[PDB]
Amino acid sequence: RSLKKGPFIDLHLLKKVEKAVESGDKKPLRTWSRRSTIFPNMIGLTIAVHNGRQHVPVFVTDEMVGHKLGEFAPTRTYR
Amino acid sequence: PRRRVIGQRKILPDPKFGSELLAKFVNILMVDGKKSTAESIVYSALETLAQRSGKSELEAFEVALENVRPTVEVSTYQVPVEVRPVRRNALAMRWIVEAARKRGDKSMALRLANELSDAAENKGTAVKKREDVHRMAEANKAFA
Amino acid sequence: GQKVHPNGIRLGIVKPWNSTWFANTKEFADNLDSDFKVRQYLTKELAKASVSRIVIERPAKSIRVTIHTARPGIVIGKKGEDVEKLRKVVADIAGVPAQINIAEVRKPELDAKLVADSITSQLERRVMFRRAMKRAVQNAMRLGAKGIKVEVSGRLGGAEIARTEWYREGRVPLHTLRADIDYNTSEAHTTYGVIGVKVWIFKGEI
Amino acid sequence: AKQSMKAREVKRVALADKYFAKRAELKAIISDVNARWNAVLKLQTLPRDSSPSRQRNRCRQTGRPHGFLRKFGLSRIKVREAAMRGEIPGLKKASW
Amino acid sequence: RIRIRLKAFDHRLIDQATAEIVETAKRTGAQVRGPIPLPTRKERFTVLISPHVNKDARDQYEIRTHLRLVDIVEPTEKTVDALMRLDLAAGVDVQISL
Amino acid sequence: ARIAGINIPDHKHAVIALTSIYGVGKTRSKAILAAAGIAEDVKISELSEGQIDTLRDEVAKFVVEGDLRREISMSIKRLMDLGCYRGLRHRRGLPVRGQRTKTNARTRKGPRKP
Amino acid sequence: NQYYGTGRRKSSAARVFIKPGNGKIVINQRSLEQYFGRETARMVVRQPLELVDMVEKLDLYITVKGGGISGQAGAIRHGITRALMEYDESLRSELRKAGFVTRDARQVERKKVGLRKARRRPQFSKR
RNA sequence: CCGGCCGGGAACUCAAAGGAGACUGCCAGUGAUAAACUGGAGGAAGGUGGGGAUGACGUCAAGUCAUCAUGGCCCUUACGACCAGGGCUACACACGUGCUACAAUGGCGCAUACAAAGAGAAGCGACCUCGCGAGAGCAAGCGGACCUCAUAAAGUGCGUCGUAGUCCGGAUUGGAGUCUGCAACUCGACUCCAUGAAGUCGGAAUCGCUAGUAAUCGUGGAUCAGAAUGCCACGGUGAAUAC
């Protein structure tokens, strides 16, 4: 995969997740940051991930954790 | 060949028997510029040919190749025409080598040793190629 | 499109280079771009002066620009304030202490930069091209010039299709590599668009 | 090639030698086998154009992105034009 | 002892320059080895010659860097005083490293 | 010769007849014969029974036939039940590892339809 | 005494030294059957010495570098025939006639632009 | 200290500058006693020696207004500008050009020999230690015929495999990682373990090559932080055939 040293999330998503788990899961999060590895504290939140045009809501299950965000937001619509 | 009549280049003879005939035979057998491999195959195959027939090396080769040399070869006419000697033994070697590549034995030295042995009593595949050429030039004899 | 540039195939044979500095890979691009700036500036600010060549050389952290021109007096001026002004701004551009020299191109009708600039100037003063070309070939063949070919091209006389119409007199041996062919090229921005003027001048066989 | 792009290129160089080569120190020294804190991996809120892997190496004269040649600093087109005129020293046709 | 290594793009210009530095040095000082030539670096550049498609039309170019090495042996004060400020070369890079 | 399952390989060198076990290639087989102290080029004929169940004892220490097939199947099911890119991609029957589907996706996608 | 030949062949160079003596061949401080005499055609370094024979005639200390197997071997052949200024210009009648004093000036042809190699043009489609 | 390693030698390879050399020059024959052709000697080379650069007047109103320049037209709170995410990587399909194969003239393991040409400072990065490996750590030397990339590989000598979809082939896929880079999900490269398709020589048809050529084997470079089976170069082995 990547990275022997740390996983990756953006610092703005770090702060939005800390405030999102502190004051309870109230609303989906506008996230453009698809670069970001799902952390175990993010479990239960609804984080909408940008797929180029739309923020699609991603409910975090326990087995999302070894993954990037953008895996759960497909960008190309094939029929 | 449109204009240019040509010479020909001189090949080095064989490093074991001094035979330019057999040197051209290892060049006919050679693939991908690998000459060492081809001369190993020729030395092994003709060595077991000399051991099997008991004659000698290149007279067993010269008999086995003497049985496959074509005599003559072929609106659309298929005229019969007399083969030049250099082309004669060139075709001989090409048919021996090609028929030896067709065979289903283990090693190339056994395929070619068995093909030269099958050509010593003229019953192999290259003799069927020679008889085939001679049926074509014998059927169409009416054009000279 | 098929002929080699007749300066470039003669670069080691008879023609010299217009830049004659050595530089390693660290400063080759920087020296080269600094040369584009000093030839760009020094070409724009001497448009009236009939400049032929500008030769750069860099002896040990200092530029040495040589202006081959046909009118050296207008480059120097009344006591050479224009020269010291030019080396001041060339020292501004290149960032090194600048020297500057002026080489007088006598016989200016045998220099292809001056001929192409002449015909270009006449074409953008709206004169007919056959006079400009034909006069250029006649007065160039008049003084030496074992051959000359001029070639204008492109929407000539304000047409709606583009022609070429080249002329030549004498011998212009362009595949011969020891031929001293002085070739240069200009563009005439007229009110109908660009008109390309090429001119080859054969001077001698070695 | 689109003035905007050349200006954008100068922006990226100026940020590249302002921040990084001074705080790219971080990514060379602290992301290392030393302790750890997650902190300096998150201290890449530097303006993303300080990264020197965002310069394109455009042509010095025309700003063309493709066909660049690092020795001369120019695209292949201006290398040929200038090479033939004789402003590139030493450079001439090759044949062997 | 004192190696002077000269580089230039023009071989006439570099052997002129090194002939001048040789006769300067062994005229004033002593014990100059000689202009050893040290292989020419040929850097080749293969550009596309057209402003659009047409890969197969290319133009090949080269820059030949010539070296010469001198290697002056005797460290006379006269040859290092007389060796400085006297080049009269324009396209030569010298390296006068001891 | 019935090692690690119903697998019965024979009349072949032991480095290579062990590769018949689903979950051992060449490397892992060199590890089994080195760990069991067996020469690499003996057959299963000409090999004792105590020697065979030392090979059983060694091949039991890696995840092989059944456990490996259901482990792989479990991995693929986890992906397809996540509905990630690798799962949708794994589900439609199109190449996973970011390859070219405009042409030449043909192992993964099967021989061409019309 | 000591007799020299330069002897090169496709990017090789074989210094050939000859003293009169036995029939030994010393190539890069190594024997003939150990340098390339485990390989194809060690006969060609011995071809100049079958025109009048080497049986116990001359020890030759040869030193070749550059090139391949056959390149080095052809270089030694040319080197010995250049180094048979031991005897006079007598030999160079017959040694000329075997085609041995000819420097075989076949070199690898350069790759040319738009061709995959020196002449193999890339294949062209429909028409 | 057996290594050009040292003192040393400048012979030799070589390096690079300057010269000599090949011109039908000599001989014989044929030919309008002409041009020339055929053959021979000498010579490293023999008849534009090999290769390259060099591409006439013009043709295709061929290609490029997106390298650049440019006439006219058009947008000028937008057809200009800044940003994040996406796309250019989509896939029922069809075509082009390549790579790897289908194997025994081979696969694998062990040992061992012979290159040329290049690149390198925000770079090439030894030695040594750790890791199965990609790599990591400390870090000399080198702006370079001095150091590094960098071990050439086919070859050869042994052993094994034994005509099997096999010890062929490596696609695909799961897992585990390394590096570069703010960041490898869309969408890198490489490594390790596992998986092990299709393919057994290709229908009609079609292409390249005339000699260091084709074929085959490796190596380097440009672009480039990282990304070539492409491109541009370099050498190794080395044919067949031309009535």
Side-chain angles (χ1 to χ4, degrees):
Chain A
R1 290 184 285 173
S2 288
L3 264 98
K4 75 168 198 291
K5 285 310 210 136
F8 192 71
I9 40 106
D10 284 332
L11 192 139
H12 58 86
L13 184 66
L14 192 51
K15 290 176 57 68
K16 287 184 181 304
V17 157
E18 296 295 326
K19 291 185 288 146
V21 299
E22 188 62 30
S23 299
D25 49 352
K26 55 178 84 188
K27 291 173 192 306
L29 283 74
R30 282 180 189 278
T31 60
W32 288 265
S33 177
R34 314 182 81 206
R35 330 191 153 284
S36 297
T37 299
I38 297 169
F39 271 83
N41 61 4
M42 301 169 74
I43 299 171
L45 299 170
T46 58
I47 35 194
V49 182
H50 190 257
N51 69 353
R53 63 183 174 163
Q54 182 63 254
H55 293 278
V56 46
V58 171
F59 178 73
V60 186
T61 323
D62 184 74
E63 69 277 4
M64 304 283 175
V65 170
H67 296 289
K68 297 286 192 293
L69 281 170
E71 295 184 359
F72 306 101
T75 56
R76 295 171 181 89
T77 72
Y78 179 70
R79 201 61 50 70
Chain B
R2 154 66 55 66
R3 169 193 290 145
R4 191 58 67 203
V5 291
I6 53 173
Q8 65 185 345
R9 67 173 65 73
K10 295 213 303 286
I11 64 178
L12 263 50
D14 185 68
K16 190 177 282 185
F17 298 106
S19 180
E20 290 177 2
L21 194 64
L22 198 144
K24 176 133 287 146
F25 186 78
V26 317
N27 288 127
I28 293 284
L29 195 148
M30 178 174 82
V31 78
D32 297 330
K34 298 177 83 145
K35 200 160 180 191
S36 180
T37 301
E39 67 192 358
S40 299
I41 290 168
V42 170
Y43 289 168
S44 298
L46 272 76
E47 184 179 348
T48 65
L49 182 64
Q51 190 193 345
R52 176 176 308 102
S53 62
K55 292 175 63 66
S56 170
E57 197 83 13
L58 62 85
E59 71 180 0
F61 176 67
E62 195 274 334
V63 160
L65 183 139
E66 188 163 13
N67 287 317
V68 302
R69 285 172 183 157
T71 309
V72 290
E73 67 178 1
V74 295
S75 292
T76 298
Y77 285 169
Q78 292 295 101
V79 301
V81 69
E82 288 76 10
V83 60
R84 314 295 297 161
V86 181
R87 182 178 170 74
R88 189 190 295 274
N89 54 12
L91 287 171
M93 294 176 182
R94 190 183 297 152
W95 295 339
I96 286 164
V97 174
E98 168 206 325
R101 300 289 269 275
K102 294 294 201 302
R103 293 175 72 84
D105 304 333
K106 287 299 199 67
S107 177
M108 190 64 208
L110 291 176
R111 296 163 77 184
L112 187 125
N114 287 318
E115 181 66 31
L116 290 171
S117 293
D118 288 333
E121 60 266 18
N122 68 15
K123 69 178 177 72
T125 311
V127 297
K128 196 154 194 297
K129 179 71 171 171
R130 179 188 61 80
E131 289 175 355
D132 186 75
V133 161
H134 192 67
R135 287 182 186 83
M136 291 287 296
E138 188 65 26
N140 292 113
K141 194 186 280 307
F143 299 110
Chain C
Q2 68 264 48
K3 290 177 200 44
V4 78
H5 187 285
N7 187 19
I9 193 67
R10 269 71 179 260
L11 278 177
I13 314 304
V14 289
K15 304 299 285 175
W17 285 267
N18 301 317
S19 294
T20 53
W21 43 266
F22 181 81
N24 282 323
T25 318
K26 308 282 296 171
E27 65 271 13
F28 200 88
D30 288 328
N31 289 330
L32 200 53
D33 176 69
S34 173
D35 296 347
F36 291 109
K37 297 292 209 184
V38 304
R39 296 167 195 271
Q40 183 177 32
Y41 181 74
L42 202 59
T43 297
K44 182 183 176 157
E45 293 294 329
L46 292 176
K48 301 152 203 285
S50 297
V51 57
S52 168
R53 293 168 69 244
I54 28 189
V55 171
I56 311 295
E57 64 186 2
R58 300 187 184 196
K61 300 288 288 209
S62 179
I63 205 170
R64 181 70 63 82
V65 188
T66 300
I67 300 166
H68 292 279
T69 188
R71 290 191 206 168
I74 199 195
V75 179
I76 297 170
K78 182 213 305 273
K79 293 312 293 148
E81 194 271 329
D82 294 330
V83 168
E84 63 193 2
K85 178 158 68 65
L86 290 174
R87 67 171 187 85
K88 183 144 153 75
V89 293
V90 165
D92 290 330
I93 290 171
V96 295
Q99 282 184 8
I100 188 164
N101 297 121
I102 288 97
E104 183 176 357
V105 183
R106 65 190 165 276
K107 298 171 149 86
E109 76 273 7
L110 297 183
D111 184 77
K113 179 61 170 142
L114 303 176
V115 173
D117 182 70
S118 171
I119 300 164
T120 288
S121 298
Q122 295 174 4
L123 290 176
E124 65 188 354
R125 291 178 176 86
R126 309 159 72 140
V127 316
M128 291 164 165
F129 61 91
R130 285 189 293 271
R131 290 182 188 80
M133 294 178 61
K134 195 163 160 203
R135 287 177 199 284
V137 175
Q138 285 170 2
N139 63 8
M141 293 296 292
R142 178 185 182 85
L143 273 82
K146 297 183 186 340
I148 181 167
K149 175 162 66 169
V150 309
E151 193 268 330
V152 311
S153 67
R155 200 191 229 277
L156 291 79
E160 290 171 340
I161 49 98
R163 295 174 291 180
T164 63
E165 198 162 358
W166 60 277
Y167 289 155
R168 73 171 156 73
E169 287 296 326
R171 190 161 69 79
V172 183
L174 209 43
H175 275 232
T176 302
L177 299 176
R178 63 178 174 210
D180 185 73
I181 297 283
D182 188 74
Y183 165 78
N184 210 335
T185 302
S186 183
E187 291 195 346
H189 299 92
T190 63
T191 191
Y192 293 101
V194 178
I195 297 169
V197 177
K198 295 189 174 86
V199 46
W200 298 262
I201 296 170
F202 177 62
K203 288 184 171 59
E205 302 78 8
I206 194 169
Chain D
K2 191 195 283 296
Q3 290 293 111
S4 170
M5 307 299 297
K6 302 153 77 153
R8 205 184 297 176
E9 189 65 26
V10 178
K11 287 177 169 293
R12 297 188 174 100
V13 174
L15 293 171
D17 57 2
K18 187 203 308 285
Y19 293 102
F20 282 170
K22 176 72 175 58
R23 279 190 276 277
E25 182 274 333
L26 293 172
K27 86 184 175 192
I29 296 174
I30 301 102
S31 310
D32 192 359
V33 190
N34 287 317
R36 66 177 193 81
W37 58 88
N38 192 18
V40 299
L41 175 66
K42 305 297 180 283
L43 209 158
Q44 301 291 103
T45 60
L46 294 173
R48 183 184 273 239
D49 290 334
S50 59
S51 185
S53 298
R54 289 174 59 103
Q55 286 87 39
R56 190 50 190 183
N57 280 321
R58 294 180 177 272
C59 180
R60 195 72 75 89
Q61 290 181 8
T62 64
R64 181 183 162 86
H66 291 281
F68 185 78
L69 285 184
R70 190 188 278 127
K71 170 69 163 280
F72 306 103
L74 299 166
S75 289
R76 57 182 182 70
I77 305 166
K78 302 298 183 221
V79 166
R80 179 154 156 277
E81 297 307 323
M84 289 311 215
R85 293 192 187 93
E87 298 96 6
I88 299 172
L91 181 60
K92 71 188 212 295
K93 299 267 294 221
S95 58
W96 66 91
Chain E
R1 176 70 186 206
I2 298 161
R3 302 178 171 281
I4 298 168
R5 197 169 73 200
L6 281 85
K7 292 165 88 184
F9 295 142
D10 191 77
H11 66 276
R12 301 185 284 177
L13 192 122
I14 196 169
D15 68 1
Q16 282 299 109
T18 199
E20 292 171 350
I21 204 64
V22 159
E23 72 173 12
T24 296
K26 75 186 181 70
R27 185 186 63 194
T28 61
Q31 291 301 108
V32 172
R33 291 299 175 175
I36 302 155
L38 288 182
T40 293
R41 181 72 89 166
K42 291 170 189 167
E43 303 217 342
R44 294 185 168 88
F45 299 100
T46 306
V47 306
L48 285 204
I49 197 184
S50 172
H52 201 62
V53 60
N54 297 123
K55 60 151 187 290
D56 282 328
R58 300 193 193 187
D59 204 349
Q60 284 161 357
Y61 290 143
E62 71 181 357
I63 299 181
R64 291 193 186 180
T65 301
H66 306 287
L67 285 85
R68 289 298 174 269
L69 185 137
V70 177
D71 203 359
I72 300 160
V73 174
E74 184 66 29
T76 309
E77 300 299 328
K78 296 203 162 66
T79 192
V80 68
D81 288 331
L83 192 137
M84 294 302 300
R85 305 177 304 286
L86 295 169
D87 52 355
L88 59 91
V92 174
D93 183 78
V94 289
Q95 286 175 347
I96 54 166
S97 300
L98 274 64
Chain F
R2 197 183 78 265
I3 45 184
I6 57 98
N7 191 13
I8 309 168
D10 201 357
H11 299 284
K12 193 180 290 212
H13 293 278
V15 281
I16 289 154
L18 282 172
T19 65
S20 296
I21 289 93
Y22 181 97
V24 43
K26 191 172 180 204
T27 307
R28 186 67 185 86
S29 176
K30 297 300 287 161
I32 289 170
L33 297 176
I38 312 302
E40 68 153 4
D41 57 350
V42 295
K43 298 171 194 174
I44 294 101
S45 62
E46 194 62 30
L47 199 147
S48 298
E49 188 61 30
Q51 199 168 7
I52 285 166
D53 64 0
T54 50
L55 265 72
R56 298 172 191 272
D57 184 74
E58 291 299 328
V59 77
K61 296 180 180 170
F62 193 77
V63 175
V64 288
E65 295 275 338
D67 195 1
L68 188 61
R69 286 171 192 279
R70 75 189 72 221
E71 186 178 333
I72 291 166
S73 180
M74 197 63 74
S75 301
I76 295 169
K77 285 176 184 181
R78 179 194 78 213
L79 296 166
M80 293 190 295
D81 293 333
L82 275 168
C84 65
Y85 184 77
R86 186 189 307 113
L88 293 172
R89 186 61 60 171
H90 223 292
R91 177 174 283 293
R92 196 173 176 84
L94 284 186
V96 166
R97 302 145 123 79
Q99 301 156 6
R100 190 161 198 286
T101 66
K102 181 172 192 180
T103 43
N104 296 329
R106 196 57 56 196
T107 291
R108 190 58 169 117
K109 190 172 151 175
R112 55 178 52 77
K113 289 168 191 175
Chain G
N1 182 12
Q2 188 68 263
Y3 293 138
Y4 184 73
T6 59
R8 63 183 80 70
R9 165 92 177 89
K10 56 191 289 208
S11 193
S12 298
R15 299 175 164 191
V16 173
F17 293 95
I18 288 175
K19 296 185 312 195
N22 294 320
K24 73 181 66 174
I25 290 98
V26 174
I27 169 173
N28 287 316
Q29 291 84 18
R30 184 69 63 191
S31 173
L32 175 63
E33 288 79 14
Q34 306 172 14
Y35 194 77
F36 61 91
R38 297 167 55 196
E39 294 182 317
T40 316
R42 79 176 80 75
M43 74 167 299
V44 304
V45 305
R46 196 167 157 283
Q47 286 186 358
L49 292 176
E50 291 203 32
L51 281 73
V52 293
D53 208 349
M54 60 173 283
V55 175
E56 180 181 1
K57 179 171 75 179
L58 47 88
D59 293 332
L60 50 95
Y61 175 72
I62 53 180
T63 299
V64 63
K65 68 197 227 290
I69 298 302
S70 179
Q72 286 181 347
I76 295 154
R77 180 168 62 69
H78 186 207
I80 296 167
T81 59
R82 289 286 292 276
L84 292 177
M85 66 160 317
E86 182 269 331
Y87 293 155
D88 55 349
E89 298 286 331
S90 179
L91 289 177
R92 284 185 48 190
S93 297
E94 290 87 358
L95 202 56
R96 177 89 196 175
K97 185 135 57 79
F100 290 172
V101 305
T102 306
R103 164 66 171 83
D104 192 3
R106 294 184 285 174
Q107 300 220 338
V108 292
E109 183 180 359
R110 70 178 284 273
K111 177 201 186 285
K112 297 163 190 181
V113 69
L115 279 61
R116 282 197 295 107
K117 55 201 285 251
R119 298 180 181 190
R120 170 77 178 81
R121 183 174 300 280
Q123 78 159 16
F124 95 101
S125 64
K126 67 149 303 168
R127 292 298 289 173

